[PDB]
Design a protein around this ligand. Structure first.
Ligand code: NA
Length: 240
């Protein structure tokens, strides 16, 4: 069972290629400073994961940049600190500052040589253009939550990808779904019978950070601690 068996990789973006945990810690810094209970990073991320995934279910058609402001409000109210709508809206704009993992641009450019690259992302298209600039690769397709009308882990996102990859000359069995989030990506990927590759960005950390804690952890065909390690295993495959 080999990385080279696939014509395409489908990538989650935020948490896999973009360091959204660092990004949102920064975007929430003013808000969490108001709380002054000195919350740990992961408590902030997990609190965000809860309000984000629930609001994504509540208003699946809402652009991510308009959804995160509601998450900010919910966090502020849960934590019991004051806030303004203007801060909420600004937090939804902060995605465009969320930094790439440093191995992402180089890894994606390497992978581009060997695979069509597909994005399957919990994001709106306007926001994602900024992330794509940070990533410095051309994607063969970008299937976003805005396109879909729903957020991962909804079935609709994978259905929407499967219904469009024919335009790229692909079938679902050609695609290795590559992602960090067990909850958003690997549970549904397995439900759709996709081969999957877990980029275990949190290998040296505890718990699931900005993704919901899955009750039934999914299997995965490949696992690597980083995009760099995915590339390393690929180069090794070609050596053999
Ligand atoms: Na994403």
């Amino acid at each position: 069972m080999r990385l080279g068996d696939y014509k395409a990789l489908s990538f989650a973006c935020y948490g896999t290629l973009i360091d959204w945990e660092s990004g949102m810690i920064e975007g929430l810094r003013e808000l969490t400073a108001r709380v002054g209970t000195d919350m740990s990073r992961d408590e902030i991320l997990q609190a965000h994961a809860r309000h984000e995934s629930r609001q994504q279910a509540q208003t699946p058609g809402k652009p991510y940049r308009d959804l995160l402001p509601i998450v900010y409000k919910r966090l502020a109210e849960q934590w019991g600190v004051p806030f303004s709508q203007a801060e909420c809206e600004e937090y939804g704009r902060s995605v465009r500052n969320w930094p790439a993992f440093v191995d992402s641009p180089g890894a994606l450019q390497y992978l581009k040589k060997y695979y069509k690259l597909i994005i399957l992302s919990n994001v709106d298209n306007k926001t994602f253009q900024y992330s794509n600039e940070k990533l410095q690769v051309e994607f063969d397709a970008i299937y976003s939550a805005e396109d879909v009308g729903a957020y991962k882990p909804s079935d609709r996102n994978f259905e929407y990808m499967n219904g469009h990859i024919g335009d790229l000359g692909l079938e679902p069995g050609d695609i290795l779904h590559t992602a960090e989030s067990l909850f958003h990506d690997h549970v549904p990927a397995r439900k759709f019978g996709m081969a999957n590759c877990w980029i275990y960005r949190r290998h040296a950390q505890e718990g699931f950070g900005a993704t919901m804690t899955p009750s039934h952890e999914p299997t995965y065909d490949f696992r690597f601690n980083s995009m760099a390690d995915l590339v390393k295993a690929h180069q090794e495959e070609l050596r053999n």
